[PDB]
Amino acid sequence: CFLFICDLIRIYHHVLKVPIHESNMNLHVEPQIFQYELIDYLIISYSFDLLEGILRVLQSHPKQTYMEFFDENILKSFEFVYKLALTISYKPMVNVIFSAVEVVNIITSIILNMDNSSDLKSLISGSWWRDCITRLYALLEKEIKSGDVYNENVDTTTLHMSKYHDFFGLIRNIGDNELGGLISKLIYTDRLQSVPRVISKEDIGMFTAPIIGYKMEKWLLKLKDEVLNIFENLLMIYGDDATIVNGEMLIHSSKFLSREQALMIERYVGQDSPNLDLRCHLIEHTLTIIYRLWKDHFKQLREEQIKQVESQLIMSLWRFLVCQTETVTANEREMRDHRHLVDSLHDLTIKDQASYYEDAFEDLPEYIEEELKMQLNKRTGRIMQVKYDEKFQEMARTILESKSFDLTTLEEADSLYISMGL
Amino acid sequence: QLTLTTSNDVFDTLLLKLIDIFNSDDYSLRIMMTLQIKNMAKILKKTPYQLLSPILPVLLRQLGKNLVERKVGFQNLIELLGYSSKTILDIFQRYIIPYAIIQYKSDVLSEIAKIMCDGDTSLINQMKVNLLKKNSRQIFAVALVKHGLFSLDILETLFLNRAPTFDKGYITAYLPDYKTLAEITKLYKNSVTKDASDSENANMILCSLRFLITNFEKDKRHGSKYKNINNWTDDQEQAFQKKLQDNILGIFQVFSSDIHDVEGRTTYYEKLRVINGISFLIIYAPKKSIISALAQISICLQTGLGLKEVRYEAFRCWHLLVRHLNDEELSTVIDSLIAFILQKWSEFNGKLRNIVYSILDTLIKEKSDLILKLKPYTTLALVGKPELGILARDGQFARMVNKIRSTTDLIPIFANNLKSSNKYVINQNLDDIEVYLRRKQTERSIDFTPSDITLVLGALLDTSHKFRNLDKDLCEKCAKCISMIGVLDVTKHEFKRTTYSENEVYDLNDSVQTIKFLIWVINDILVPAFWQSENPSKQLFVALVIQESLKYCGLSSESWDMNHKELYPNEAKLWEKFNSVSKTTIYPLLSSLYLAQSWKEYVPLKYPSNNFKEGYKIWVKRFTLDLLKTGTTENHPLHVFSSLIREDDGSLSNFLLPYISLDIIIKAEKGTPYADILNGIIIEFDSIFTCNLEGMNNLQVDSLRMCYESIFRVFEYCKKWATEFKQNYSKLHGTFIIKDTKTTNMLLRIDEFLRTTPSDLLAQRSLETDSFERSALYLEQCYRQNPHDKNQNGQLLKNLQITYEEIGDIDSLDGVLRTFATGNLVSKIEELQYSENWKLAQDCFNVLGKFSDDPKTTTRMLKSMYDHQLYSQIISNSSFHSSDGKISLSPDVKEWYSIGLEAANLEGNVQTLKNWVEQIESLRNIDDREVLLQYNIAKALIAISNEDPLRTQKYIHNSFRLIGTNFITSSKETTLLKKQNLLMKLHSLYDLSFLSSAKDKFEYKSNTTILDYRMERIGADFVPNHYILSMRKSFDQLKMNEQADADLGKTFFTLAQLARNNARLDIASESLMHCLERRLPQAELEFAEILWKQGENDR
C-alpha cells in the first residue's frame, strides 16, 4: 500500500507543481472551475495522509518486524515524494507538508526504538538525509504570521495554508474545514454520474473572526516543533559524526532561536493571542537542540561554522542569562497583574478546565491551587521573556561560560556581564 | 526599529548611525548590532548586503583614511556582509581609491593591493597601476574639488610616486574627457539649507569647470589662479558658455550610461549623485545649454522617478528644473511627469506629497501660461483627480478652471497622447476619457458631426492592438472607453485613411529624394521616438541616427543657422520643411558628437535558421538587423539605423524592412553578395509560409500573423516603388519608357521577386490572416495568371466564397456563385440566403441539417440562423440538446457553442442560460477565444438576475479584458465595416454595466433615457439596432423589477417597429405579441402596420 500510494502520487505529478507566479497576460477569462482542482487536492491530501497512516500502523507492530516493510524501493519512493511535498520552486501545499514531515518523524522514531538499527541505517544513503535536512531547514526558516496566513503572499517565507485547499483530511483537523461543504456538493445525490457537479471557484470566501488565523498559527507552531523535534531525534540516531549532524544545526537553529526571541520581545508580548506560550516553547525547546549539540557533539562543530553564528548564538544565550537578575517578579501580588495583561487567555483556559474538564480541579484542598499560583506564575514569567526556567539558564550558561570553545574572550565576556549587573 | 519607520534620506542616515555604533569597540554593542542588523535585513526580505550596499559608498569611504588601524572593523563589516573582502572591494573600488591616493604618502594602497590580489607573488605593481587607471576619472574629480589640486605637476608628481609604472606622466589629455566632467559635477552635494561649505564646494566645482573646458591647452600649468572665484572677468565668460555647450551632451551621455545600469553594477547612490549633477547643471550653467539637452534629463529624471529610493531627490531636481525654465519649452516634457504624479499618487507619503504640492503651486501661480492655454489637458488632469485637491488651494485658479473646461476642444489632444509609449500617460488618458465620456453622456451633447470622435476611437483601437501581449489592465480600460464611445454610424464616420498621399515612395538612388525621405523620417517617427523613449540608451541611439542623417543631409558639420551666414538658401529652404515641434528638439544636435558604433560582435548569421519560436518581435528585429548590416556599407544612408533595432519594440524594424529590402532588390548581375543575401531572404520567406501552424496555441499563431503582415508589406512596397519608378522615369527622363536595357534589368528583379513563393499561397496564407480584401486580390491574381479554362476552379472557389461572405460585399458573391460553379444544387440553394428568400433556404438547411453526416453542414445551418437573428430557434436546436445536455470536448463543436451561448445571451431566459453554462463548466480546458466572451456575458446575465451588482461588474470587466486583448485588432488598416461586429458587442457590454449600476428606479429611468440617447448615434442599420435592443430585452426580463418590465414593454415595441421598417416582420410580430400581455394601447396600430407590410390591405 505504501508503494502504491507513492507511485499514485507520482501519477498526480502536477498538483504539487503549480508555478510561483503566472504570466502577466494570464487572463482570468475562464470557466473558473474548482471541482477538478478539488478532486485532485483531495487525492493528494488523502494520499499523503494515508502515507502517515501506513507508517504509524507499521510503527505499532512489534519491534522485530520492521525489515519486512523497508527495502530500497520504500526509501527511494518516499525520497521522491518527499522532494515533491516540501517544495522549493513551486507553490507549497501545507496539507502535505504536515504529513510529509510526520512521516520523517515516524522513520526517525522507529530507527531509535528498534533493535536492528543498522540495517535501516545501512539501507539509508546519506544523500537521502542531506536532501531531507536542507528542506527541513528551509521549512524552519519560514515565518508564521496570523494576519497573512490565509492571504496569498510571497513564496517560501510564510507558511500560508491556501484558501483553495482548506479542509480537514484524514488524521488531523487542520483548518476550519471551509471546503467540506463542497465535498458533499460535488455529487448530485439523486443520480448516478461520472463527471462532477460543478462548483464555482470564486463563490467561496465571504470577515467575522481572526481566531481561525490563531488556531492555524497553533498548527504551524506545532509544525516547527515537529521539525526541530526530528532534529532532536536524528541527533540521537547519528550520535557519532557523519555527513549530516554537521554544525548547520548551530546555524539554522540559532538563527531560529535568535529571531523567535527577538520578534517575540519586539512584537508578541502583550498581544493577547493564545499562541504565545507554544511560540515561547519553541525557543525553550530549540535551546536544547543547541545544548546537546554543544555538549555531546562538539567534535563536528567546526571552527568556521561556529563563527558563522557568533552574533546570534551568543545573543540568544545572553537573552537567557539576562533572567538571572530577576527584579521583576519577586512576589505574588503584581505578577497576577502581569498575567491580566499578557495571559488572560490562559486564565480563561484554566477556568474552563477547572469547572468542566478536569477531575482534580474541584474542592481545591489548599495545596493544588498553591501549585497553581506557582505554575501560572512561572508560565507568565516564561511568556513575559524575563525569568525563564532555571534549567534553561544553566544550559545557556554552560555553553557561553564553558571552555569548549572561545565564543568570547574574558575581556569580551564581562562586557556582556555588565549589561545585567554582575 | 526606529529606522524601520523612515524613508530614503533619514533611512540611510540612520543606517550610518547604526553602523558607527556597530564599530563602537564594545563587544556587547557589536554582537547586539549584528543580531539586529541581520533581523532587520530578513524582515525586509533582503540580504544584509543589499540592505547596506546603498551606504557602503559612504561607510567605508572614510575607512580609506584609517584602513591600517581599523582592520578589525573592516573585518567585522566583511563578516557581516557575507561576501569575501575582495568581491565587495572591486565593486566599491570607485569610492575609496580616490581617497586612498590623495591622503598621506605612506599609503593604504599597498594593503589594498594586498587584498585586491592574492599574495606577493601576484605582482602588485601592474594591478596597482591599472586600478589607478581604472577609476582615474573619480581621482581627478576628488583632486579638483576635495583638495583644490589645480596644478598638473601636482597631479603628475603625486601619481608617479604612488605608482612609478604610471604611463606618460598622467594618462594624457584625459582631463577634458566627458567622464571627468561628470565625476566633477556628481560631487555637488546640496540641501534645502544652503551652508557656507555647500557654497564653498559649489564654487570649487564651478571653478574646476572653468579650469577644464574654456582654456585647457593654454592653461594646463597656470591653473593655481583659477581657484579664486571673483578674478573671473566677463570677457572670458562667453568663452566658458561657448565651450560648455560643446561639452555638455556627452556628460549627459555618461549620466545616461550610469543611471540605466544594464549589468547591475551599482546601487542607487550613483543615481543620487547623478541627480545631484543634473541639479548643478540646472543651476550653474547658461540657459541655452539646458534648453539644448532637455531630452537627456527628461528620461534621466523619468528613471529617477521610476526607481523607488531616488524619488524625492528627483522630484526636488524637477522642482529646480520647473522654475529655471519658461513655458513654451517645458511643454515637451510636462505630460510625462504630470501623469506620474496622478497615476502614482497613492503610495506617496507626507514628504513626497509636500514636494509635489510645491511642484503644482509653483506650476499654477508663476507658470500658468503652459497649463491654461498652451496645453489645457494638464489642468483638467489635475482637476480630474479630486483626491489631490487643486481647487481648495488657490481659488483664483478655479476662476480659470471653470472656464477652461468649456472653451477647449479636448478630443484631438487625446488623439496624439494615446500614441505615446510610456504606460503612465496612457493610463492617465484612459482614466480621463472614461470620466470625460461619462460627463458627455449625461451632458447629452457629445458631438457627432457628419475634432471627431472617430479619431479617439482609432487611437484606442491602435492602443489596444499595441498592448495585446503587455499589461491586460490598460487594454481592459481601453476597451471600456471604446464601449463608452459605442457604435458609430458607418456612413457619416470614417477613419483617417492616409494612403492617397506622398505614399511613402522614395527612390534611395537620387540624393534629392533621399534627403526628402530623411527629413520625412526624422519628422514623423524619429522626433517622437526621441522624446517618448523608455531607457536612455534608446534615446541616445535615436539621437545618433537623427544626427548622422542630418550629417548625410549636409546640415550638421557646417554651421549656418545663426543667420550670420545667410549664404545658404538651399539649406534654409531644406531646413524649413521641418515643423517647429521637431525644430526645437533637432536644433541642438546639429553640432553634437555622438559616436556609438559598437562593432565586431556582430556574427552575420545564415538566413533560413528561423527565429519564430522566440517570438515575432525577436524575429523581425534579428532579420532586419541581418539585412541592413549586410547590404549598406556605411555611405548608403540607412547604415546608422542598425543602432535602433537592438532595443526596438518591433515597430521601427517593421517600418524599415521594406526600404532596406527594396534596396537589396536593386542590386544586379548577381556577382556580389548583395544578391546572394537576397537568396537568403527568399528561402526565409519560404520559412515563413511553408511552416507548421499547428502544435502551437493562440500566441504563436498570432506572431505568425504578424510575420505574415511584415512581409506582405514589403511585397506591396516593392510593387508600389516599381510602379512609381516607371512613372517618374517616363515623366522627367523623356517620355518613351524603354531605354538602356539596365533599368529594365532593375525592373525584372521585382518581377521575379513578386512571383517567387507565388500565388495560391499568398492567398492561402492571407485569408487566414483576416485581411480579406488582400486575399481577394491574391485570389483574383491567381485566377487570371492561371489558365482558368481548365479544371483548377474546384479548389479555388471553396475559399473564394469565404473571402466575400464576410467582406461586406454580396453582389459579387451572388455573382461568383451563379457563374462557373453550377454543378451542385446546394450551391444554387445557398444563393437564396442573400436575396430576400432567406427563409426558403433556412428550412432547406434544417432538413439538410438532419442528415448527421458532416459537422460543417450543421454549422452552416447555425451560421445561417445567426446571420438572420433566429436566436430562439438557435437555442431550441436539437443539435445541442441530445436529451438535456451536450457532448464532450470540442474539435468543431466549439464553433457550435459560440453560437449557442450567444443566442442564449440574446434570448433572456434564466433557465436555458443557467443550465447552458452548467454544461459549459463541466469542460476541462476551454481553448476557444470566442467561447469565453459569450460565456462571461452569460454568467454576467445570470448574476444580474440574482441581484448581485459587483459580481456582474466582475464578469463584464472580464469580457472587456477578453475583447481588449484578443478580439480587438489594429485600426487604420481595416474598415469600420468589419470592426462593427465587435463594436456592437462592446455597446452591448457597456449598457449592462450601466444598467446594473443602479440601486433604485429614480436613476434607472435616467439610465434608460441615457441609453435611448445612445440609440441615436447607432445609425439605422438593422443588425446593431436589433442586437442592442435584444440585450436590453435580455436585461429587463432577468431583472424582475416592475420598472424593468415597463422598460421591457417599450423595448418590445421598439423591436417591433424597428423590424417592420426593415422589411423583416417575421420577428416584428413575435416581438409585438409580448406587448399584448402587457396590453399596451399602442399595439393596435403596430399590428396594423405589420398587417400592411405583410401584404393584406383590407384587414
Tab-separated table of C-alpha atoms in Angstrom, chain A residues 24-31 33 35-36 143 154 188 196 198 200 202-203 258-259 262-263 266 308 310-312 314-315 318-319 407-408 412 415-416 419, chain B residues 1 26-28 30-32 34-36 38-39 42-43 45 467-472 918 921-924 926 932 935-936 951 954-955 958 961-962 965-966:
chain	number	residue	atom	x	y	z
A	24	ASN	CA	1.113	38.996	-16.594
A	25	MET	CA	-1.087	38.125	-19.577
A	26	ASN	CA	-2.646	35.200	-17.725
A	27	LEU	CA	-6.157	36.407	-18.466
A	28	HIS	CA	-8.645	35.104	-15.926
A	29	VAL	CA	-11.318	34.623	-18.547
A	30	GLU	CA	-12.133	31.032	-17.887
A	31	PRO	CA	-14.990	28.897	-16.567
A	33	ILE	CA	-13.978	25.675	-12.222
A	35	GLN	CA	-14.377	20.748	-8.944
A	36	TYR	CA	-11.439	19.071	-10.705
A	143	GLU	CA	7.546	32.781	9.126
A	154	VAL	CA	5.424	35.969	-1.249
A	188	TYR	CA	-25.848	15.251	-7.375
A	196	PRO	CA	-18.580	16.154	-11.105
A	198	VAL	CA	-20.000	21.949	-10.915
A	200	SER	CA	-17.807	27.639	-8.971
A	202	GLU	CA	-14.969	32.269	-6.744
A	203	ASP	CA	-18.055	31.803	-4.571
A	258	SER	CA	17.529	34.367	17.936
A	259	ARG	CA	14.735	35.624	15.696
A	262	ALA	CA	13.806	38.962	19.013
A	263	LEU	CA	10.444	39.444	17.383
A	266	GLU	CA	9.541	43.305	19.907
A	308	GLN	CA	29.048	31.847	11.025
A	310	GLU	CA	28.769	34.115	16.719
A	311	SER	CA	26.376	37.028	16.802
A	312	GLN	CA	23.244	35.015	17.088
A	314	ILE	CA	25.838	34.412	21.943
A	315	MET	CA	22.947	36.882	21.782
A	318	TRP	CA	22.541	36.063	26.603
A	319	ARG	CA	18.779	36.566	26.462
A	407	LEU	CA	32.918	32.160	21.946
A	408	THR	CA	34.016	35.220	23.929
A	412	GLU	CA	34.708	40.494	25.892
A	415	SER	CA	31.392	43.353	28.587
A	416	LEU	CA	28.297	41.160	28.322
A	419	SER	CA	24.758	44.629	30.849
B	1	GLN	CA	13.021	49.711	14.804
B	26	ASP	CA	32.449	47.368	22.791
B	27	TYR	CA	31.759	43.675	22.405
B	28	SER	CA	28.164	43.794	23.649
B	30	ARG	CA	28.853	44.729	18.368
B	31	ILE	CA	27.036	41.433	18.927
B	32	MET	CA	23.686	43.149	19.550
B	34	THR	CA	24.980	42.240	14.290
B	35	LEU	CA	21.849	40.486	15.527
B	36	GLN	CA	19.552	43.465	14.992
B	38	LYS	CA	20.508	40.708	10.415
B	39	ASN	CA	16.932	40.546	11.725
B	42	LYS	CA	15.466	39.454	6.972
B	43	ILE	CA	12.234	41.232	7.962
B	45	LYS	CA	13.168	40.326	2.801
B	467	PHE	CA	-0.526	46.069	-25.962
B	468	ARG	CA	-2.129	42.730	-26.875
B	469	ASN	CA	0.665	40.906	-25.028
B	470	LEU	CA	1.595	43.555	-22.444
B	471	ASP	CA	-0.443	44.717	-19.423
B	472	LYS	CA	-4.029	43.384	-19.733
B	918	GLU	CA	-23.740	24.463	-16.209
B	921	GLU	CA	-18.334	24.490	-16.825
B	922	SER	CA	-18.188	20.704	-17.000
B	923	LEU	CA	-15.454	21.104	-19.618
B	924	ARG	CA	-11.732	20.871	-18.922
B	926	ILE	CA	-11.697	25.848	-22.997
B	932	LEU	CA	-15.217	32.674	-23.379
B	935	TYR	CA	-19.613	32.699	-21.642
B	936	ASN	CA	-18.654	35.656	-19.464
B	951	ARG	CA	-20.422	40.025	-9.438
B	954	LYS	CA	-16.665	41.496	-12.357
B	955	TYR	CA	-17.818	39.347	-15.253
B	958	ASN	CA	-13.700	40.018	-17.688
B	961	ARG	CA	-10.410	42.206	-20.799
B	962	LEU	CA	-11.055	39.469	-23.344
B	965	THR	CA	-6.662	41.698	-25.648
B	966	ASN	CA	-7.859	39.064	-28.090
